[PDB]
Amino acid sequence: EIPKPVAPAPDILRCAYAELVVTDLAKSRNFYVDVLGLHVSYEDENQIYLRSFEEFIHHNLVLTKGPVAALKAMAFRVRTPEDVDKAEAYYQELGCRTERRKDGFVKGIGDALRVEDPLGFPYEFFFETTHVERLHMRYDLYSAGELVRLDHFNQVTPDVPRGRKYLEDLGFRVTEDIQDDEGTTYAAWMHRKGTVQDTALTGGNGPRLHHVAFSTHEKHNIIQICDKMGALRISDRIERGPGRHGVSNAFYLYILDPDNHRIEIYTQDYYTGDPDNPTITWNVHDNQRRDWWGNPVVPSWYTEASKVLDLDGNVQEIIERTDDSELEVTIGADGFSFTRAGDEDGSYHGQASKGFKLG
Amino acid sequence: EIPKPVAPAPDILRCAYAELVVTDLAKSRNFYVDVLGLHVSYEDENQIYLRSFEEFIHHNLVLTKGPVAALKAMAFRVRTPEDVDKAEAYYQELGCRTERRKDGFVKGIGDALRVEDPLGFPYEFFFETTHVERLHMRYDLYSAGELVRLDHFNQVTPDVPRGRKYLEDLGFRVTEDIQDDEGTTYAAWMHRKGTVQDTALTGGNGPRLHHVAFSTHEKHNIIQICDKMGALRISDRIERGPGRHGVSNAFYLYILDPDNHRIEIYTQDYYTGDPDNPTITWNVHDNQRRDWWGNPVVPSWYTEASKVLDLDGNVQEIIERTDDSELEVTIGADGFSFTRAGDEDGSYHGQASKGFKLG
Amino acid sequence: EIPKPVAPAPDILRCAYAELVVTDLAKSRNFYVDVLGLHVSYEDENQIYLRSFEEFIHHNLVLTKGPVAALKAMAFRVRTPEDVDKAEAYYQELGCRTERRKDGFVKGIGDALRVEDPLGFPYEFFFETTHVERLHMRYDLYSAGELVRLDHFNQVTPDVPRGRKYLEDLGFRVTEDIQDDEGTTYAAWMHRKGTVQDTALTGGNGPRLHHVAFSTHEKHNIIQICDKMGALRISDRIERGPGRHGVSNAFYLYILDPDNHRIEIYTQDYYTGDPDNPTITWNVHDNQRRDWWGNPVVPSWYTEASKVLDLDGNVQEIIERTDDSELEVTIGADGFSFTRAGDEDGSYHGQASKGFKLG
Amino acid sequence: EIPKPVAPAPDILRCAYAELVVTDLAKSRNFYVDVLGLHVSYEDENQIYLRSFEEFIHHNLVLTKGPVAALKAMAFRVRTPEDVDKAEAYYQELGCRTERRKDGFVKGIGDALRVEDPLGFPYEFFFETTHVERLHMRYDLYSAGELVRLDHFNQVTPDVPRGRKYLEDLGFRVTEDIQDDEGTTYAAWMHRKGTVQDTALTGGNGPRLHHVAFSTHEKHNIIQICDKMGALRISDRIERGPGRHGVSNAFYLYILDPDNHRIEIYTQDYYTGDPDNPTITWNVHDNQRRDWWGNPVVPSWYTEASKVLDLDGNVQEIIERTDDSELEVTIGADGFSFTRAGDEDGSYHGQASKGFKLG
Ligand SMILES: [Ca+2]
Ligand SMILES: [Cl-]
Ligand SMILES: [Cl-]
Ligand SMILES: [Cl-]
Ligand SMILES: [Cl-]
Ligand SMILES: [Fe+2]
Ligand SMILES: [Fe+2]
Ligand SMILES: [Fe+2]
Ligand SMILES: [Fe+2]
């Protein structure tokens, strides 16, 4: 268990950006700029800094050339400069490795703290950032698939309750989760900014980064991303979807960048800012929990995720999940799922929905 | 080969309605009226007559109670009264059984001809029909999932080229087809009204009715049907989709009625009314041909379809397809599909796309 | 009265393209290509040939540099080469000037007939056209405002019944019209291809070209055009809309090109292809007939329209309308409109709706 | 000036509900339930309690039968029970009349404080509320025009800077405003929940309630409300729109209920939750500030608004604005607006845009 520090948690506003290590910067640029239409805040031969349509901070995504594709940092903005000091004292009390840079780790960020957190993830906390032109009314630039906000991160970790408790002490509030009747937790979603999630935990071998999620305005914008990928003959890089989520109620799509980093496109979840916001727990065997329409969850969604780096830039050792596997209990040979709880009609045993088994 | 008659083909306007035999009229009403929102033109203890939002003829769908669920008639409207006589002479020349009723077979249709066509399907030709209130601006009635038009039928038949030639002689023009490089045709689409299809042929054991398709205005209307089916906890009745088709370029969904009759929801195909409209041939191994995003085609889509009746009300005998199976050559154990022609990367050998095998 | 020829009418398929004379080819290119996203089939120093997303014929719009901005030709495609001969015989019997060129008047059109028609309009009829890449699945090119089809023309002419009879003899079928209770006709809509219109007549001084209309897939595509024009700070070139039409039921927008040629953007009218398609007549004083939401029709919509050329390239003389003016009887100082017939509440006397008078 | 209390401000979460007095409860029910599709949380012969699709608190709107149509209370939810005490001490220090009811003023609200605030408005502050079924995934109940959240209030007050400072002291942060070069403020928008606004100030005679605003998911949902009002032949109750706002960037519509209370329908503004969220100031003469497409602002929008009640149920005296009138300076006889600053082309002098003058 991870103890609650005496020191106050930093006041976290929201997820703000991710730094991803990529192996071929030009191929990654093609994906994020030419395919997905993100906006360049800065670039050179080593890095590309990208932002969404409605953003005013310097960036939502930094692509950094390196030898091994991995998550380098997932960054949260905090409310005040003093909250960076609070973050440092908090993670020091947790016994975590920290590194403080008064002029930032990446361009367009000022005083910043990076930590190897108790779950092995590289978190950054910062307040100071260079403001840029907010493009929210630049409809002369608007793409049919425009990505308008950074919405959330999702992390793979082996013990979800342990991670959940730690994030709760850090001020995140749980909105939704997936459990079974004999007390296993498979996933949890948690927020600071008044949407369903700023980060989320997926049970599995970790630390690994499951995905980074961007929003669109409308569902048709997500459809267009799929259509464009078909036209570019890269439909093999559409991993899963499009769909409606059960958990979060958002319309969604998962796609894979050139290094296999997973990107979710997302829209139209609900407001969670009231302190008594009702939590929702789904049963793991409910075949509408992940895709509301009952479409099968592609197996790579459960098995594949990105490496994460420590503060020296080396890959973090993976620790194996010992709790039950969501894949195995739902779509594996001994798994099952239901459409209506207790009804054999519309249930699936030893395979996925819609007539498929695992390949 | 089916010969071209000397007698002139009737001038067919469009698909107009289907008559489906259903086993439980109330259960069927719940699906088509309460779930899908079709508009009742007439009903009694034996039949329900339904129409789409923009229709002015009496109905697009007749549900008739009977002992064995089946297609009873797929009806095409012809341009003039005299075209019903032309239809009769044409099919008599073809050696087909015909039945003429001056006051119709169903309510709201006048003089009508039903035939057992050379592929064993029950076709109706009529001109006369009772006009009803066209609901096209009745936005006080408009559903978030509103079905606005009848679009097409799709027929399963064992020998696609044989059927195609017959339909071309009858005046349908082929818009798209699926073939391989070994001379096999797997499917064809053909039209009279200015859209991709009024009917279509899917290779398989037949005669069977694959589906009846209705249009929506927009893609979000199809999304809503999925969402509603999730809320009603009948997502098991979503067979396949939603998706973007390769062939037709339409956004689509396939759902199953209480008797397992398959309904497609469809929008935003293209204009085909010019007589030299370019005919598009897709390769059967192209994994973007059916779902442009590369999502796998559910196996029941290839195997399951509705019985059809002869003019005596008895089920037509099924003739087995001897040409290659689209399922087998694409997603079966010796199948193959590609994302990019000539690229091993993004190809699938002996399984479906997105990580699945046949259940 | 324009007499009905003995000679048969050519079988007209659809509206196909317009040739507009523009004064500054680069400024016009910026509007049609950069702002509106139409696709270039061919260009040089004198002409730009443009097509919509789903078109396979060579072009839908030819911009020709010249001294006076005007319609040079409105072109309809006919069913067969022999229909060009029929068109020549038909217009010769009407006593109209004709000009036939076996190799066309513009690039990408073959054997073509241009005529000075009985209403003074430069019509072209052609069958032969160079096929080009149909861009209907080129979602890598798809704009958030994508124009997908050419839909119709709209002509200003002083005597609507006279023009209507002539177009009916030519094979166009009236779908909707606007009249009053004193026997005046203000406008009529008429089709060949099975949508509400291929051309339309607006009562007014003429011959003048009121607009050319292009379709989008969805309503949000029309909204985007507005949004983009706001971002480009050219909202002054949004003339009227966006709205829902009463007549046609289509979602719409009117914008102005650099020479003040009016372009409509249009979507989601209804099917008219049955020969007994019900006609709809609106009263001119019904304030939902042009904008279903009751928004006022901007006065320039009634007063402004483009010059048209004769076959020698000179502007056609304008003949004044003597029938009552739709502007005057609805929104002028002695005008009237209603929301509900017979109800003083929601009616407008001597002013437009929503609190406005004419500027 | 309204001095800042030494007592701490209550921690306000968001706008939560309005209580409107209506004169004919059944007619009001028709509008809000049958036309707009709001969901009933409770009703009797005197009151109707309504909520939006995604709400979990008891209601977002209370309709109360009474003799004079008016705003009875605009309610904000506070973070904790203790914040109701804080509100009481805060307004007592300001010298305002307050009333505390430990069991609430309306059903489904617990301990609540109502105040006659320094601008004459009846504010309520509460924490405790009865949770109800959150309908966010009840797609079986979803309307084509579904209202999904309560978004904001908008208040008419004569001195915008005076009101702005008072609301800033209360914790609201300004996101956008409208000013001129002479230093007049015409309007300001301010938030607690991390959208553009929870309440807003429009310069004018007050206190009056300008509107209550509900969100939709998508722009097409707003279009449907218009279309439905057309079909119900109540387009005269569409006051203004639909449009895109400049200020807020939201897609919008204004409609009028049976007592002329104005309701805005709204979607797709941007995130404001960072503490240094950039504040946007628009010039009053910018014709894209209110409608981004330059459509004219209906004069009733500037002149008409609802009465508000004091705590005895009597109408508050209305104080006239002495600062310049936005109507007069933009669309009145001595007003002007521009499309591009400094360009006479696309400017309007002594009249509105798009060819209209004041009726
Ligand atoms: Ca082969
Ligand atoms: Cl999921
Ligand atoms: Cl398909
Ligand atoms: Cl109009
Ligand atoms: Cl506004
Ligand atoms: Fe996610
Ligand atoms: Fe189909
Ligand atoms: Fe038009
Ligand atoms: Fe507002």
Side-chain angles (χ1 to χ4, degrees):
Chain A
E1 193 146 40
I2 303 160
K4 179 175 164 102
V6 172
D11 181 350
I12 296 160
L13 299 167
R14 56 169 173 136
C15 64
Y17 78 90
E19 181 178 16
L20 300 177
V21 180
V22 301
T23 56
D24 182 327
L25 195 66
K27 286 183 186 195
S28 297
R29 195 187 191 284
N30 177 242
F31 187 80
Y32 287 99
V33 178
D34 301 324
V35 182
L36 295 181
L38 289 162
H39 300 278
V40 177
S41 297
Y42 185 80
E43 68 181 313
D44 65 21
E45 59 192 348
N46 303 318
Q47 295 181 307
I48 303 167
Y49 292 71
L50 296 171
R51 72 178 186 271
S52 62
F53 196 62
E54 302 185 337
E55 187 59 82
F56 73 94
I57 73 167
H58 184 261
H59 57 264
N60 299 125
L61 186 62
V62 185
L63 309 177
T64 297
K65 188 185 166 77
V68 180
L71 171 77
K72 188 161 179 163
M74 49 201 288
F76 299 93
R77 199 174 188 209
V78 297
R79 181 167 293 281
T80 68
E82 292 75 19
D83 283 295
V84 183
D85 293 319
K86 286 161 67 185
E88 189 172 18
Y90 193 88
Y91 283 95
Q92 284 172 351
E93 187 177 341
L94 288 172
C96 293
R97 189 186 170 181
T98 69
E99 187 182 351
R100 180 70 175 267
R101 291 200 195 177
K102 256 47 212 4
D103 291 316
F105 292 81
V106 302
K107 289 173 177 62
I109 306 289
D111 180 41
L113 180 78
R114 287 184 180 191
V115 310
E116 296 168 7
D117 93 342
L119 304 183
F121 289 86
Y123 273 13
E124 185 178 278
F125 300 91
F126 74 91
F127 171 74
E128 299 172 345
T129 181
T130 304
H131 294 197
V132 293
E133 182 188 355
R134 192 174 206 164
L135 303 171
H136 72 299
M137 302 193 72
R138 292 291 308 280
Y139 294 106
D140 57 318
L141 307 179
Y142 191 83
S143 169
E146 191 72 30
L147 304 184
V148 304
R149 284 184 297 281
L150 177 73
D151 192 74
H152 67 266
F153 309 127
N154 187 301
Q155 304 171 226
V156 189
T157 198
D159 180 340
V160 176
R162 177 178 191 251
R164 173 190 159 153
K165 192 266 198 195
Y166 150 70
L167 289 171
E168 286 178 324
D169 288 341
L170 185 60
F172 292 80
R173 274 94 80 234
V174 179
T175 52
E176 303 209 33
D177 67 353
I178 297 175
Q179 295 188 41
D180 66 21
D181 286 344
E182 309 211 336
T184 298
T185 299
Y186 298 86
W189 287 254
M190 56 272 287
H191 85 97
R192 292 289 297 171
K193 76 180 177 301
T195 69
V196 171
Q197 51 188 319
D198 281 288
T199 199
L201 301 180
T202 299
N205 304 334
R208 287 180 298 152
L209 174 72
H210 199 281
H211 59 268
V212 180
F214 290 89
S215 299
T216 61
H217 287 133
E218 302 199 342
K219 299 180 283 284
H220 62 83
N221 299 110
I222 294 178
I223 290 167
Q224 163 63 13
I225 294 166
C226 296
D227 288 333
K228 184 176 184 179
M229 290 178 75
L232 291 172
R233 283 277 170 180
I234 57 172
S235 61
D236 58 326
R237 311 307 289 172
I238 299 170
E239 188 194 30
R240 174 184 164 216
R244 170 76 66 187
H245 283 306
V247 176
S248 84
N249 192 43
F251 196 88
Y252 75 87
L253 175 69
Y254 301 93
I255 60 180
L256 301 172
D257 92 350
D259 288 293
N260 305 325
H261 297 307
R262 181 184 289 107
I263 304 299
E264 187 179 1
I265 323 299
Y266 183 93
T267 193
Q268 290 164 36
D269 71 347
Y270 56 87
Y271 165 80
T272 60
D274 284 12
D276 64 348
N277 181 69
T279 60
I280 305 167
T281 300
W282 299 73
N283 184 260
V284 75
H285 301 287
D286 185 337
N287 193 56
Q288 295 187 186
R289 79 197 179 286
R290 287 200 174 275
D291 190 78
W292 182 239
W293 308 335
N295 280 323
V297 178
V298 307
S300 62
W301 203 90
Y302 292 125
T303 64
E304 309 305 300
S306 302
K307 298 163 183 169
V308 315
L309 302 184
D310 67 24
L311 294 170
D312 302 315
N314 300 313
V315 172
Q316 284 280 14
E317 174 194 18
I318 299 308
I319 302 177
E320 292 200 328
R321 181 171 171 86
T322 59
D323 290 343
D324 285 352
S325 162
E326 185 165 4
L327 181 159
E328 293 292 351
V329 307
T330 64
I331 64 172
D334 281 334
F336 81 99
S337 70
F338 64 81
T339 301
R340 295 161 293 277
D343 192 356
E344 293 295 313
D345 293 335
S347 70
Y348 306 103
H349 297 272
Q351 64 188 52
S353 55
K354 313 299 185 196
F356 299 114
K357 71 176 192 189
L358 297 164
Chain B
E1 188 164 271
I2 302 163
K4 187 181 171 71
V6 175
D11 182 352
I12 299 160
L13 297 169
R14 56 169 175 140
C15 65
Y17 77 91
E19 183 181 9
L20 299 176
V21 179
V22 301
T23 58
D24 183 320
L25 197 65
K27 291 280 186 177
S28 300
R29 194 187 189 286
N30 182 252
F31 185 80
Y32 290 99
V33 178
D34 300 320
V35 179
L36 295 179
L38 290 164
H39 299 279
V40 177
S41 301
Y42 185 74
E43 64 185 312
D44 68 16
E45 60 190 8
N46 303 315
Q47 293 183 306
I48 302 170
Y49 294 71
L50 300 169
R51 72 181 184 268
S52 64
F53 193 66
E54 299 187 337
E55 188 56 81
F56 71 94
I57 72 165
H58 184 263
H59 57 259
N60 301 125
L61 187 61
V62 182
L63 307 176
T64 297
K65 181 179 179 32
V68 178
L71 173 72
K72 189 162 189 179
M74 43 193 302
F76 301 90
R77 198 174 189 209
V78 298
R79 183 173 290 284
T80 68
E82 292 74 24
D83 285 292
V84 183
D85 295 320
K86 287 195 215 148
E88 188 172 353
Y90 191 87
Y91 281 94
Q92 286 170 13
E93 190 172 340
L94 288 177
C96 291
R97 202 139 80 113
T98 63
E99 183 178 0
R100 184 65 174 270
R101 292 195 194 172
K102 280 266 144 327
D103 296 310
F105 290 81
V106 300
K107 295 177 171 58
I109 304 288
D111 180 35
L113 180 76
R114 285 185 180 189
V115 309
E116 293 162 1
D117 96 340
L119 308 182
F121 288 86
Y123 276 10
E124 183 179 280
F125 299 91
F126 71 94
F127 173 77
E128 290 177 350
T129 179
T130 303
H131 293 197
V132 296
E133 185 188 353
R134 193 174 203 162
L135 303 172
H136 72 299
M137 305 191 68
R138 289 294 307 280
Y139 294 105
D140 58 317
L141 304 182
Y142 191 80
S143 173
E146 192 69 33
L147 303 185
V148 302
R149 286 185 295 284
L150 179 70
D151 195 74
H152 64 267
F153 312 125
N154 186 303
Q155 306 172 219
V156 188
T157 197
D159 182 341
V160 176
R162 182 176 185 257
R164 162 178 190 158
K165 184 225 183 255
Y166 147 72
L167 288 171
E168 286 174 330
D169 287 338
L170 187 58
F172 291 77
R173 179 160 163 96
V174 174
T175 53
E176 307 215 28
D177 63 6
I178 294 172
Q179 298 189 41
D180 65 16
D181 64 5
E182 280 168 73
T184 301
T185 299
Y186 296 88
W189 286 254
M190 56 273 287
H191 86 95
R192 292 289 300 170
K193 75 189 181 304
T195 67
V196 170
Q197 49 189 319
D198 284 288
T199 198
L201 303 178
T202 301
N205 305 336
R208 288 181 295 150
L209 173 74
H210 200 283
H211 56 268
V212 179
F214 291 88
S215 297
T216 60
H217 288 131
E218 298 199 343
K219 297 182 282 280
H220 65 82
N221 300 108
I222 293 175
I223 291 163
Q224 163 63 13
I225 294 167
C226 299
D227 287 334
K228 184 172 183 181
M229 292 178 74
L232 291 174
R233 284 275 172 183
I234 60 174
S235 61
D236 57 322
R237 308 308 292 170
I238 300 170
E239 184 194 33
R240 175 182 162 215
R244 169 77 66 186
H245 282 307
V247 173
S248 80
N249 191 45
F251 196 86
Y252 73 88
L253 176 70
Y254 300 95
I255 62 181
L256 301 173
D257 92 349
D259 289 294
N260 309 325
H261 299 307
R262 180 185 291 108
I263 305 295
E264 186 181 1
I265 322 298
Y266 184 94
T267 194
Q268 292 165 29
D269 66 350
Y270 56 84
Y271 166 83
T272 61
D274 286 11
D276 64 347
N277 184 71
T279 305
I280 302 167
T281 300
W282 298 76
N283 191 268
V284 76
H285 303 285
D286 183 338
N287 192 55
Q288 298 186 186
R289 76 197 181 285
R290 286 201 178 274
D291 189 84
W292 179 240
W293 308 333
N295 278 324
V297 179
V298 304
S300 62
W301 203 89
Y302 291 124
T303 63
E304 306 307 297
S306 300
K307 299 164 184 176
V308 316
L309 303 184
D310 69 22
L311 293 168
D312 303 313
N314 296 317
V315 171
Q316 281 286 13
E317 53 145 27
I318 302 303
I319 303 302
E320 287 205 312
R321 179 177 176 85
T322 57
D323 285 351
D324 290 348
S325 161
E326 185 162 7
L327 183 157
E328 290 295 348
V329 306
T330 63
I331 63 174
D334 292 321
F336 173 74
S337 299
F338 63 81
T339 301
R340 290 161 297 274
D343 193 355
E344 204 62 33
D345 186 44
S347 73
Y348 302 105
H349 297 265
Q351 77 169 238
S353 58
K354 313 296 188 203
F356 297 116
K357 265 181 181 182
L358 301 164
Chain C
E1 188 205 64
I2 299 161
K4 182 178 170 174
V6 175
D11 182 350
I12 297 157
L13 299 168
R14 55 162 174 146
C15 65
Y17 77 91
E19 184 180 7
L20 300 177
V21 179
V22 301
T23 56
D24 183 321
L25 195 68
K27 286 187 150 189
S28 299
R29 195 186 190 284
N30 177 254
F31 183 79
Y32 289 101
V33 178
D34 298 321
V35 179
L36 295 183
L38 284 164
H39 300 280
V40 181
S41 300
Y42 186 73
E43 62 182 321
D44 63 23
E45 303 291 349
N46 290 300
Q47 296 184 304
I48 303 168
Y49 290 75
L50 299 167
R51 73 180 186 269
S52 65
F53 195 61
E54 297 186 342
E55 189 55 81
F56 74 95
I57 72 165
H58 184 262
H59 56 261
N60 298 125
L61 186 63
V62 185
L63 309 176
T64 295
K65 182 184 167 51
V68 178
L71 173 72
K72 186 161 177 157
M74 46 198 321
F76 300 91
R77 199 176 189 207
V78 299
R79 185 170 291 281
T80 67
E82 292 78 16
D83 286 293
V84 183
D85 297 320
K86 291 161 79 120
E88 187 170 39
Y90 191 90
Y91 281 94
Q92 285 175 340
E93 188 176 340
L94 293 171
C96 292
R97 183 180 182 188
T98 65
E99 181 174 356
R100 177 86 172 258
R101 294 195 192 172
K102 72 193 310 305
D103 294 320
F105 291 81
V106 301
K107 288 182 175 51
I109 307 286
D111 176 40
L113 178 78
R114 287 187 180 189
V115 308
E116 292 171 15
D117 91 341
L119 306 179
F121 286 87
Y123 276 11
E124 182 178 279
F125 301 90
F126 73 89
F127 171 79
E128 302 173 340
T129 179
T130 302
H131 293 194
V132 298
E133 185 188 351
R134 200 174 198 159
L135 303 171
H136 69 300
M137 305 193 67
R138 291 292 309 279
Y139 294 103
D140 56 319
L141 307 180
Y142 191 84
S143 169
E146 191 73 28
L147 307 186
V148 304
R149 290 185 293 281
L150 178 67
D151 193 76
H152 64 266
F153 311 125
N154 187 302
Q155 303 172 226
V156 188
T157 197
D159 185 337
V160 177
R162 180 176 187 256
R164 171 193 183 142
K165 192 267 203 199
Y166 146 71
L167 290 173
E168 289 175 322
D169 285 343
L170 187 58
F172 291 82
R173 307 111 167 177
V174 173
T175 53
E176 306 205 33
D177 69 346
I178 294 173
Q179 298 187 35
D180 67 14
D181 66 6
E182 286 168 67
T184 300
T185 300
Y186 297 87
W189 286 254
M190 54 274 288
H191 84 97
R192 289 292 297 172
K193 72 187 181 299
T195 68
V196 170
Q197 52 188 319
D198 284 288
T199 198
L201 302 178
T202 300
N205 301 342
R208 288 182 291 156
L209 173 73
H210 197 283
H211 57 267
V212 179
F214 289 89
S215 304
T216 59
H217 286 133
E218 298 198 344
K219 297 180 283 285
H220 62 82
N221 300 108
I222 293 175
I223 302 311
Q224 162 63 16
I225 295 168
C226 299
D227 290 331
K228 184 174 186 181
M229 293 176 73
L232 292 171
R233 284 279 172 179
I234 58 175
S235 59
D236 57 327
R237 309 307 290 172
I238 300 171
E239 188 197 27
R240 174 181 164 216
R244 170 77 66 186
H245 281 309
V247 173
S248 84
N249 195 41
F251 195 86
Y252 75 85
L253 178 65
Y254 300 92
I255 63 182
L256 302 171
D257 92 349
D259 287 296
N260 306 323
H261 300 307
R262 180 185 292 106
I263 304 296
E264 187 180 3
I265 323 295
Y266 184 91
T267 193
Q268 291 163 34
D269 70 348
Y270 57 88
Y271 167 82
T272 62
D274 286 11
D276 64 348
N277 183 69
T279 60
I280 305 169
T281 298
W282 299 72
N283 190 266
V284 73
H285 305 278
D286 182 337
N287 194 55
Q288 300 188 184
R289 77 201 180 284
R290 284 200 177 276
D291 191 80
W292 180 237
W293 311 331
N295 278 324
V297 180
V298 307
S300 63
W301 204 88
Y302 292 122
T303 66
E304 310 304 298
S306 301
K307 300 167 197 184
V308 315
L309 305 184
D310 70 20
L311 292 184
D312 300 313
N314 302 311
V315 173
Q316 281 279 13
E317 177 169 60
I318 289 158
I319 302 306
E320 287 191 353
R321 178 173 176 87
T322 58
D323 285 350
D324 289 349
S325 157
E326 186 164 4
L327 180 156
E328 295 292 352
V329 306
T330 65
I331 59 175
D334 296 325
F336 177 78
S337 75
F338 62 80
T339 300
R340 294 160 294 275
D343 188 0
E344 186 68 36
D345 186 48
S347 71
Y348 305 104
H349 298 265
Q351 55 191 337
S353 59
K354 317 293 188 200
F356 297 114
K357 272 189 332 191
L358 298 203
Chain D
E1 68 119 13
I2 301 159
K4 188 174 158 93
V6 72
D11 183 351
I12 298 164
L13 298 167
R14 54 169 175 138
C15 66
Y17 79 89
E19 181 178 12
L20 299 177
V21 179
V22 302
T23 57
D24 184 321
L25 194 68
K27 289 190 175 173
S28 300
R29 194 190 193 283
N30 292 165
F31 186 80
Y32 289 99
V33 179
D34 297 328
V35 181
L36 296 182
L38 288 166
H39 301 277
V40 177
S41 299
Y42 186 78
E43 72 180 306
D44 65 19
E45 40 278 306
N46 298 313
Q47 293 183 308
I48 305 166
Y49 291 72
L50 298 169
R51 72 182 185 268
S52 65
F53 194 64
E54 297 188 342
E55 187 56 81
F56 73 94
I57 76 165
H58 186 260
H59 56 262
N60 300 127
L61 186 64
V62 184
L63 307 177
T64 296
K65 185 182 174 186
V68 179
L71 174 73
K72 188 162 175 159
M74 48 203 318
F76 300 93
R77 197 172 190 213
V78 297
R79 183 172 290 284
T80 68
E82 305 101 275
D83 286 293
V84 183
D85 282 339
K86 290 183 162 166
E88 189 172 0
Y90 194 90
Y91 285 94
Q92 281 172 343
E93 189 173 345
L94 289 179
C96 290
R97 186 183 172 181
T98 66
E99 189 178 347
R100 180 73 172 266
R101 293 195 191 176
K102 287 275 139 82
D103 302 307
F105 291 83
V106 300
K107 290 179 171 61
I109 303 293
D111 181 35
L113 178 85
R114 287 184 179 190
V115 304
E116 297 171 3
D117 96 338
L119 307 184
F121 286 87
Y123 275 14
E124 184 179 279
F125 299 92
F126 73 91
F127 170 76
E128 298 171 342
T129 178
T130 302
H131 293 197
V132 297
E133 180 190 351
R134 198 173 202 160
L135 305 170
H136 72 298
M137 305 192 70
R138 288 298 304 281
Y139 296 104
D140 57 321
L141 307 181
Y142 191 80
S143 170
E146 190 74 29
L147 304 182
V148 303
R149 313 186 189 182
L150 177 72
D151 193 77
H152 64 266
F153 311 126
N154 186 303
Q155 304 170 224
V156 188
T157 198
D159 180 342
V160 177
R162 183 177 186 252
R164 176 195 180 135
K165 180 201 173 295
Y166 148 69
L167 290 172
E168 286 174 329
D169 289 344
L170 191 56
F172 289 82
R173 293 178 104 123
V174 175
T175 51
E176 308 207 31
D177 63 2
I178 294 170
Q179 295 183 32
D180 68 14
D181 289 354
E182 171 179 309
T184 300
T185 299
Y186 294 92
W189 286 253
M190 56 272 284
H191 84 97
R192 292 290 296 170
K193 75 184 176 302
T195 68
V196 170
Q197 49 186 323
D198 283 288
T199 198
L201 300 181
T202 299
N205 306 340
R208 286 181 301 155
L209 174 73
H210 199 283
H211 55 268
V212 180
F214 290 89
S215 302
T216 61
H217 286 135
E218 297 197 342
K219 298 181 282 283
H220 64 81
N221 301 108
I222 293 174
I223 290 164
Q224 162 65 13
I225 294 167
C226 297
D227 288 333
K228 185 173 184 181
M229 293 180 71
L232 294 173
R233 282 278 173 181
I234 60 176
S235 57
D236 56 328
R237 311 308 287 172
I238 299 170
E239 189 195 29
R240 176 183 161 214
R244 170 75 68 183
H245 283 307
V247 175
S248 85
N249 193 46
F251 194 86
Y252 74 86
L253 177 67
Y254 303 90
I255 66 185
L256 305 171
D257 91 350
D259 291 290
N260 276 70
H261 298 306
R262 182 186 289 108
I263 304 299
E264 186 181 3
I265 323 294
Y266 182 96
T267 194
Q268 294 162 31
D269 69 350
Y270 56 87
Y271 164 80
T272 61
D274 282 13
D276 63 347
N277 182 71
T279 311
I280 308 169
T281 299
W282 298 74
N283 188 264
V284 76
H285 302 287
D286 184 337
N287 193 54
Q288 297 186 184
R289 77 200 180 283
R290 285 201 177 272
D291 189 80
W292 180 242
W293 310 331
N295 281 324
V297 179
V298 172
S300 61
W301 202 91
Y302 289 124
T303 65
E304 307 309 296
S306 298
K307 295 164 186 176
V308 315
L309 303 183
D310 68 24
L311 290 174
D312 302 313
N314 298 316
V315 173
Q316 283 280 13
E317 46 264 61
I318 284 156
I319 305 310
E320 288 184 35
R321 178 175 175 85
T322 57
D323 286 347
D324 288 350
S325 158
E326 184 164 4
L327 182 158
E328 294 291 351
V329 309
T330 62
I331 60 171
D334 303 319
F336 80 100
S337 71
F338 63 78
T339 300
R340 292 159 298 271
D343 190 1
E344 291 295 335
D345 184 36
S347 288
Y348 304 103
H349 296 264
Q351 61 193 5
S353 58
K354 313 301 189 200
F356 298 117
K357 260 184 130 179
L358 285 165

